[PDB]
Amino acid sequence: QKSWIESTLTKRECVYIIPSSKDPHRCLPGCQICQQLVRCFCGRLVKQHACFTASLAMKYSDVKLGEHFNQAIEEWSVEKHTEQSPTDAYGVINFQGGSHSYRAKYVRLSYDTKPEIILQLLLKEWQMELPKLVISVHGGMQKFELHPRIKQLLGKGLIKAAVTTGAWILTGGVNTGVAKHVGDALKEHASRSSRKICTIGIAPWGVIENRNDLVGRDVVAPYQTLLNPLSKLNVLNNLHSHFILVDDGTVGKYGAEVRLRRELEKTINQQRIHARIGQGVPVVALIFEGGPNVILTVLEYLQESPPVPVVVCEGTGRAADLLAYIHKQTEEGGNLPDAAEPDIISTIKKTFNFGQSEAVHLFQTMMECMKKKELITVFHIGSEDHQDIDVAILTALLKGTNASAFDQLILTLAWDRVDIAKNHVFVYGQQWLVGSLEQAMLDALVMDRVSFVKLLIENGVSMHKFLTIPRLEELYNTKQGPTNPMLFHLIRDVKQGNLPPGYKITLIDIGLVIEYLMGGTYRCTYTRKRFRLIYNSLETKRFPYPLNELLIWACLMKRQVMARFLWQHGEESMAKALVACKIYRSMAYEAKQSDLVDDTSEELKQYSNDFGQLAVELLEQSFRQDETMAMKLLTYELKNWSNSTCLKLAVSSRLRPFVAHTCTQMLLSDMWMGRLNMRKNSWYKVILSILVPPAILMLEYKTKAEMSHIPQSQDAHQMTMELPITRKFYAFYHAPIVKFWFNTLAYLGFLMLYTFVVLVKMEQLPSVQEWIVIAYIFTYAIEKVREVFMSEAGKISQKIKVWFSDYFNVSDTIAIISFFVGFGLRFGAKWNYINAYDNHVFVAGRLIYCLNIIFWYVRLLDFLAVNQQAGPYVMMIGKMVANMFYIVVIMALVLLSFGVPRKAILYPHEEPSWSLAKDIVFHPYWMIFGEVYAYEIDVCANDSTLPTICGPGTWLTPFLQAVYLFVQYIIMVNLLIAFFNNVYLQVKAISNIVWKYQRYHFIMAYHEKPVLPPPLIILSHIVSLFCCVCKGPKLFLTEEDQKKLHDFEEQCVEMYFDEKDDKFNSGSEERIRVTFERVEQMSIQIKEVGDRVNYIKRSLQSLDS
Amino acid sequence: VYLQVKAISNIVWKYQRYHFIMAYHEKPVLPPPLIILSHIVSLFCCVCKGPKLFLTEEDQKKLHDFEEQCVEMYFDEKDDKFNSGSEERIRVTFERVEQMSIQIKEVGDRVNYIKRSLQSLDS
Amino acid sequence: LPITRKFYAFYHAPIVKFWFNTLAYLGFLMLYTFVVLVKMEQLPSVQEWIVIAYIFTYAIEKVREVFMSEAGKISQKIKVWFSDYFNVSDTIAIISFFVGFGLRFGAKWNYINAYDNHVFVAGRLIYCLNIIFWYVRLLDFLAVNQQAGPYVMMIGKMVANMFYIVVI
């Protein structure tokens, strides 16, 4: 059948017939009038059945021969005289009119359906999600009216209570009862609002208009709101999203809905509210009017097991006005005050007139309701009852139903409502147990509800006690919440490619992920001996810093709102923000590169850049407070983050705004000096003190106190304890500023020689000038092999892959290799002794030198770039060569568009020759640079320098060249002037940032360099290899300075969050709106007090007469 | 004039990129020395005997649902932006200080008619 | 995905048709540049026949583009095809080439010295100018890139706007 509905759900049709009561309507021909009018006691008359079996009985006179023994007339039994079949009416209502064409779903099932099959319909078949609340609205059965005051408020909270909790509203569906005003509340307060409420309406099929219109299989129904005055039935309301229409077999009568509805309430309250929680989906009953069937229903619920509470609304109709009335005059449980029988029966006799016996009967039904006063809520809309029915509907389930504070909290957790938990579960004087709070935390973390994690920490949860191994090991192994498919992939990589099927994640495996994601020499606390030991054992399992471990969890699970929350709790705030930037950045890179599912890398990089911006904004806060302590914050060993450093973590993530912040640049400037005080010295004296060593003793240095924020070597720090003479020489030659100039003077004296060598004749054997040059380039290359081995990271292929990621290290490799190719050819050649340059091998070697020299001038940009101003312009050149590339590809096309016709028109009689490759490209390029070749244009002219080139067609070339230069200069050169001038500012801004970033790697490279330059560096090597075989900088803090520094960081995260709010709360946009939202409330309170004075005037006339 | 010519020119390039790419679904496989094969094969298969987005029935359904949901979000977010702006909150603030100011002097007039009752019920 | 479906999937991709046409077009200009720079005897060299084959078969491709354009109204198929710069220049570049091949090929060769025939000269010089259309057409292929394309499109918009400074 290709439909679960057709196979399972069943209709009902009165196959048998039973005529109406007795009476022929009028009109003597008794036989005719019988078949014409007479209803079946089914509910439909004889000609509506059609009931093919009964049809061959319709002809006789009907089914069932005549008088039929009046016992057997009433023997109508829906179980006996009515038949099932694969249903006809299930599809989609397409409400025509209204607006937007609101679209609902329906079905025509039998009341013989089992209760579970309806839950199988809503969820599996109609594709609905199981809710966290059900609101069963009973009330008016006949169309009524509400004060537009009382209308809109119930439409504020019945919505808001159903949006947040993903609730189902079970109505009657028919547009005559509560469903009208429930349905209207959907209208005014934007039921869509990007979050539709799954409003269901259960009605019986026998009483609804347009039954035929809803017939068909998966058919879109042209159903309309045509309230014909001649109609007798009800119209399906528009704004209800779903409908269940019981097929009682009869037509016309009500009744065959109340079973299914109550059984659906059971069938939902017998479902787990959420896989993590062990309650059932609660149910609440809401009331807007009522007759006897309603207040009887109210009694049922209070009697039920489990008891379903009730919310009555004073000011809405017959019952609800009464149920608040009788309830207000009542006491603790079960009473009327001594003289109230006369008054209350009169209200019954007036409010719903049955009269003095059915009043007293239903009055006794009202007694047993008021007995269970504890479950019923009487939210009265008059002034301020139960704080805005939202609270009342939701808090009503948190009343005398014996549910302990745990069960009270966990339900507000599933709903994701803290305002309830704050104001109604953490009420003054609550009876909390030992593990209830901790257990609710484990549920909030896994379900990713930060606002309860906040609430529980505030209300007494210590995350040191709640962070054991199995818990935090469980937290990674959860599908009960927002999970990361990226994590299980990262685990497969570190595990050599294997993944056993069950595989509960462990913490030693998370450690291998973080070590992989942070890279280099990072070593997590999960892979150490202390942890691996106690791990196999499981006070001693409590993680002294848990919020360092849940910040990683939140980030490996891609739970940002949890991450930013768990970040601002604890200490080491910048460090946690800079690790987090590196985790996501690596996850983004792996997620991008790894081809597993849809990318998710745009999400992770933004998460990285969010934490990377926090760290910068903190560093600015620290820096504006105390510049000296802020520089210490950059360089202290962390001891919880693998003995790393906040700079080292920012550099690790290529986080340029932190490295280009004016604190790092202020520190890097102070490491550049060393012990020297270059505030009260000058570069004249540093250079002179290099060439005149004894002048090292007459320039000023820094004390141990100015050097307290500056990281140092072990030896450098020991020599601050003592300033003697031999300490002032160590302090000088080991400064990065001194190593620099001491290398520039050697490098400038290098080029002066190597320029001299290349311009002067070169005999068979190298001159003294040339041996000094080979010594430099040789010893300089040993220096570079030393740089690679002592780089940072023990993984060799990374030492190499990072060293060739630098322009001037790649060119040195080319410049050094090329030079010894040149020296080999120069030196190892059979000299001729008649004329050099009869040896093509000596030529090659010399010409390699004459080109190798170019690498060594361009390298002066590495030394010029140490300056503030020069450096950025150096860095621009690369960024600008990259961006002009395509204007220059067009300029090269225009070149060959011209050079090939020019050469072909002027030189026809050419054989194939490699000169053709030159001549199509040579002169047209030199035209770009001012050379017009004025006397080679018009080769047939008298002033021509190419009169032999005159021939047929050569008059075309001046036209071609006129076009050529127009295109080059007047378009393509000025487009390029236009390019640069309109891209200068942002390339100059990036280039200041990139220069300030490379200034880290530059300066920190010079702590590592030896003292002596690259002719004399070999001494420093031989001394180092002699002291390596026979036998970086840290910020040393004493114990009282690590103390005062952590106090400094905490104080600056306070000022940060404070000033961030004070800026926001003091802004224009935020004061306009709080002004706006109070003129809301006041304007209501003036008309309220404007209404009261109207009720003060009435008293004046009252007390007057 | 560089910036606005460069901005138009990104737009015009992105427009011509339609005609360019959609021209290549139509092109044969072989380039214009060997394209003649693809022609002879096409004239041989034309005498002897563009791209559509095929959706099944359940994807035309889920797609029309997607469009309707996005016109909702469009009109909603267009109003929420407007109703939440400064100019619109200043004026609804303005138009209520109109009404309240009238209702204070109104209630400021009533209390003048409450004082008269005090002297009245006094004597 | 079977084997013969992976070949269909490849050669019928627009990215593949492109590069498969650029390599043929780049190898076209390399020949047609060689033909124009080297002496041209009475009969075309192998390099030049391959060039005529391209420009011929390439023109049949363009007649196919016009007929299979979109809209059955013929004068619209034509009016829309000549609304494109590089289709107009191909019409000039293709027509000019066969004027040139006709004069080059159908001339009474002299056998004492070429260029005593003013008709052979004209045909050759048409090739030496027709070559310009076929370089500029590399901007139609360079313009496939993000960055290059817009700068290509600027040149026209900027030649139009500088017109009156250049009249002065």
Ligand SMILES: CCCCCCCC/C=C/CCCCCCCC(=O)O[C@@H](COC(=O)CCCCCCCCCCCCCCC)COP(=O)([O-])OCC[N+](C)(C)C
């Ligand atoms: C961190 C990375 C960056 C640093 C990179 C460092 C590595 C740089 C790598 C450098 C090596 C590059 C190649 C060297 C030259 C060989 C090739 C050549 O042209 O040979 C010639 C010389 O043949 C000889 O026999 C004479 C060689 C003399 C020694 C000079 C090279 C050794 C120094 C290397 C010091 C390097 C180590 C530096 C310190 C580590 C052969 O030709 P010929 O015999 O002259 O003439 C033959 C024909 N004829 C006889 C007819 C005329």
Ligand SMILES: CCCCCCCC/C=C/CCCCCCCC(=O)O[C@@H](COC(=O)CCCCCCCCCCCCCCC)COP(=O)([O-])OCC[N+](C)(C)C
């Ligand atoms: C017909 C002639 C045509 C061409 C002619 C010349 C032009 C040829 C130009 C070639 C450069 C190609 C590199 C492109 C730029 C890439 C980006 C970059 O910053 O690169 C590098 C810097 O930039 C340079 O290294 C630029 C070097 C050329 C600038 C001019 C040199 C002046 C000295 C010579 C004077 C000699 C004069 C006399 C000589 C005899 C470094 O960056 P990176 O580490 O690679 O990082 C990539 C950036 N990213 C991370 C943001 C992605």
Ligand SMILES: CCCCCCCC/C=C/CCCCCCCC(=O)O[C@@H](COC(=O)CCCCCCCCCCCCCCC)COP(=O)([O-])OCC[N+](C)(C)C
């Ligand atoms: C769409 C945009 C429009 C463009 C604008 C219009 C384009 C300009 C149009 C210019 C008109 C053309 C001028 C040539 C006229 C014929 C020459 C001739 O018959 O004899 C000459 C041949 O000389 C040549 O054949 C050289 C051809 C002229 C080159 C002009 C280049 C453009 C430079 C300017 C471009 C900027 C223009 C500025 C505009 C104000 C010489 O005479 P002869 O008797 O053969 O020989 C005598 C012997 N003798 C040589 C030994 C002495």
Ligand SMILES: CCCCCCCC/C=C/CCCCCCCC(=O)O[C@@H](COC(=O)CCCCCCCCCCCCCCC)COP(=O)([O-])OCC[N+](C)(C)C
């Ligand atoms: C979608 C739109 C874009 C595409 C457009 C496509 C259409 C392009 C249109 C192209 C046609 C252009 C004109 C062709 C040449 C004729 C003019 C000429 O110079 O004749 C000469 C050659 O006269 C001959 O008799 C030899 C001709 C040889 C055949 C070459 C042309 C035919 C190929 C065409 C293939 C085109 C079709 C391509 C495929 C469809 C006459 O001079 P001569 O005899 O050499 O010398 C006389 C004097 N003398 C003897 C004293 C020296």
Ligand SMILES: CCCCCCCC/C=C/CCCCCCCC(=O)O[C@@H](COC(=O)CCCCCCCCCCCCCCC)COP(=O)([O-])OCC[N+](C)(C)C
């Ligand atoms: C003395 C010399 C004077 C002049 C000299 C040269 C300059 C002569 C320039 C003439 C161009 C005239 C066109 C004006 C622009 C119109 C707008 C436009 O976009 O047009 C077209 C693109 O743009 C082009 O086609 C521009 C072509 C010239 C640019 C340079 C060519 C470089 C290659 C040659 C190198 C060869 C070098 C060697 C050769 C031997 C296309 O647009 P459209 O489809 O028409 O749509 C109209 C736009 N609208 C819809 C917005 C209205």
Ligand SMILES: CCCCCCCC/C=C\CCCCCCCC(=O)O[C@@H](COC(=O)CCCCCCCCCCCCCCC)COP(=O)([O-])OCC[N+](C)(C)C
């Ligand atoms: C690697 C780094 C080393 C460190 C650098 C310091 C140590 C290096 C210092 C010196 C080493 C050189 C020894 C000098 C030998 C004297 C003979 C001589 O050269 O006579 C020449 C005169 O010219 C000179 O005397 C000057 C030669 C050097 C010029 C460059 C020096 C500047 C750099 C250093 C100082 C400034 C430092 C600037 C920066 C602050 C005559 O020419 P010839 O070639 O002898 O004659 C044969 C000619 N023939 C071949 C054509 C037949």
Ligand SMILES: CCCCCCCC/C=C\CCCCCCCC(=O)O[C@@H](COC(=O)CCCCCCCCCCCCCCC)COP(=O)([O-])OCC[N+](C)(C)C
């Ligand atoms: C990776 C580095 C290694 C590079 C490869 C190894 C390079 C070493 C290669 C060769 C070493 C052996 C040299 C002799 C070659 C045989 C020919 C011969 O002997 O004599 C001939 C030389 O003919 C030449 O071509 C000489 C120049 C060739 C050197 C090319 C170096 C470029 C390498 C790239 C640059 C490095 C850049 C590297 C940057 C990364 C003739 O000279 P003759 O003997 O005097 O006889 C006179 C002839 N006569 C009778 C006609 C008058």
Ligand SMILES: CCCCCCCC/C=C\CCCCCCCC(=O)O[C@@H](COC(=O)CCCCCCCCCCCCCCC)COP(=O)([O-])OCC[N+](C)(C)C
């Ligand atoms: C269109 C704009 C207005 C112009 C309209 C008017 C012009 C119309 C167009 C072209 C005019 C062509 C004739 C002029 C030459 C006469 C003199 C002559 O003989 O010159 C030379 C030959 O010249 C030729 O043989 C010409 C080649 C054919 C023209 C090719 C198209 C060029 C223009 C592109 C197409 C046009 C569209 C371009 C769009 C801008 C000299 O050769 P010779 O005689 O052998 O000399 C003896 C040599 N000896 C002593 C060394 C042995």
Ligand SMILES: CCCCCCCC/C=C\CCCCCCCC(=O)O[C@@H](COC(=O)CCCCCCCCCCCCCCC)COP(=O)([O-])OCC[N+](C)(C)C
């Ligand atoms: C239309 C598209 C086709 C597709 C392209 C591929 C197929 C086309 C491939 C080949 C077809 C050509 C056959 C070669 C014949 C050999 C003889 C020869 O030419 O000898 C010459 C040497 O020069 C050469 O051998 C090279 C000649 C071609 C240069 C351009 C090839 C690059 C393009 C294609 C390849 C790279 C592709 C790049 C793109 C990725 C000697 O000169 P000559 O003229 O023989 O001697 C007479 C001289 N005379 C007249 C002065 C008296």
Ligand SMILES: CCCCCCCC/C=C\CCCCCCCC(=O)O[C@@H](COC(=O)CCCCCCCCCCCCCCC)COP(=O)([O-])OCC[N+](C)(C)C
């Ligand atoms: C739409 C396309 C069709 C174009 C029109 C049809 C073109 C075909 C036209 C003509 C075909 C017939 C050629 C012969 C002409 C008569 C003269 C003659 O025979 O000999 C003379 C040639 O004199 C010349 O002028 C030769 C060059 C003319 C060709 C012009 C082509 C430009 C067309 C525009 C370019 C196309 C651009 C199209 C782009 C849209 C002399 O040469 P000879 O015979 O060797 O005698 C030696 C003389 N002597 C004794 C002095 C030494």
Ligand SMILES: N#Cc1ccc(COC[C@H]2O[C@@H](n3c(NCc4ccc(Cl)c(Cl)c4)nc4c(N)ncnc43)[C@H](O)[C@@H]2O)cc1
């Ligand atoms: N204090 C200080 C200080 C001293 C020197 C420097 C120079 O920095 C050198 C490094 O600067 C790097 N670099 C450079 N180098 C600039 C440059 C290098 C070579 C040449 Cl020929 C030129 Cl025309 C310009 N440009 C970069 C870029 N656009 N993006 C990222 N990195 C770039 C490059 O790896 C090179 O090794 C920077 C700061």
Ligand SMILES: N#Cc1ccc(COC[C@H]2O[C@@H](n3c(NCc4ccc(Cl)c(Cl)c4)nc4c(N)ncnc43)[C@H](O)[C@@H]2O)cc1
């Ligand atoms: N992917 C991709 C892609 C590939 C190629 C292209 C190139 O587009 C070609 C078309 O671009 C058209 N075109 C162009 N072409 C640019 C151009 C054409 C020729 C030359 Cl010589 C130059 Cl100096 C520049 N400019 C236009 C403009 N200013 N306004 C409207 N249309 C313009 C023109 O009709 C031409 O046919 C565009 C996108």
Ligand SMILES: C[C@@H]1CC[C@@]2(OC1)O[C@H]1C[C@H]3[C@@H]4CC=C5C[C@@H](OCCC(CO)CO)CC[C@]5(C)[C@H]4CC[C@]3(C)[C@H]1[C@@H]2C
């Ligand atoms: C898309 C672009 C179009 C333009 C262009 O790039 C690509 O197309 C390329 C094709 C090249 C030619 C191919 C083959 C040869 C043969 C050789 O024959 C040696 C003979 C003898 C020496 O005497 C041996 O001993 C001489 C050189 C020549 C003609 C090339 C010249 C440059 C050309 C024209 C290039 C040009 C820059």
